[PDB]
Each structure stands twice: as structure tokens, then as C-alpha cells.
Nucleic acid binder design. Structure first.
Lengths: 49, 56
DNA sequence: ACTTTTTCCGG
RNA sequence: AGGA
DNA sequence: AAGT
């Protein structure tokens, strides 16, 4: 069924950006700790808190 | 305060040596030290304290 | 004469 | 060096 | 950008 509205439809040059979810996503639930502070390590890479 | 903070105690006579948990030896691999800055600085104190002691 | 803060999160 |  |  036809839309009651008419859509602004045409090509538009879109760019893909360097930020992609699966490179951003992170979870931790007990992991590596600092030596000094004995606290969770920093950064997704390092499986940080 | 006579019990916890007499003025004479602001002048250091006997320096407390903090234990390793405070100045960890970041011992990368087997045969390689990696001692903390506080360890180096305490060494410099000792080094200077010995020269003075012998000197006098 | 003289000091100290300023939003939150790969190398 | 970079995101919100 | 302020204030001992």
C-alpha cells in the first residue's frame, strides 16, 4: 500500500567511517589487574575494566 | 598534640622504608631487574647518607 | 611575591 | 593521535 | 583565568 507521503529520493555520496561496532564493543567480568594499585587494567585490548 | 604530633617530629631523624608493594619491581622476563623510581630515589638517599656518615 | 583547576571515553 |  |  502506497505511502500517504512522498519521499525525497535520490543519490547522495555517503562515506564509510573508521569506527565500526565490533572494534568498539567490550565486556569484562574479572580480568587482569594492575601491579601497583591491584585494580583492573586499562583498555579494551588489554581486557580492561 | 603531645601524643600524635609534637613539633620535633617535623624534622626527620629516622626515615621509614616503604615495602615493595608500594615500590614494585616491574620484573619483565627472568634475568632483568626493573626497579621502581622510589627504589632508585631511596638508593640515592642511602648513597648520600653513607657519604655523610663516613665523612663526619 | 606566588600557585593551581579546567566534561567523559588506540599507542 | 582521535571519537561523543 | 583567577586568587593565597
Amino acid at each position: 500500500k502506497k505511502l500517504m507521503a512522498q519521499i525525497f529520493f535520490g543519490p547522495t555520496y555517503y562515506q564509510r567511517l573508521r569506527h565500526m561496532v565490533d572494534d568498539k564493543i567490550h565486556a569484562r567480568a574479572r580480568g587482569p589487574m594492575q601491579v601497583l594499585t591491584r585494580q583492573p587494567v586499562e583498555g579494551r585490548s588489554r581486557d580492561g575494566g | 598534640n603531645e601524643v600524635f604530633s609534637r613539633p620535633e617530629w617535623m624534622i626527620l631523624t629516622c626515615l621509614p622504608v616503604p615495602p615493595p608493594p608500594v615500590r614494585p619491581s616491574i620484573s619483565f622476563n627472568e634475568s632483568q631487574r626493573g626497579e621502581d623510581d622510589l627504589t632508585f630515589k631511596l638508593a640515592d638517599i642511602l648513597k648520600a647518607n653513607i657519604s655523610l656518615e663516613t665523612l663526619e
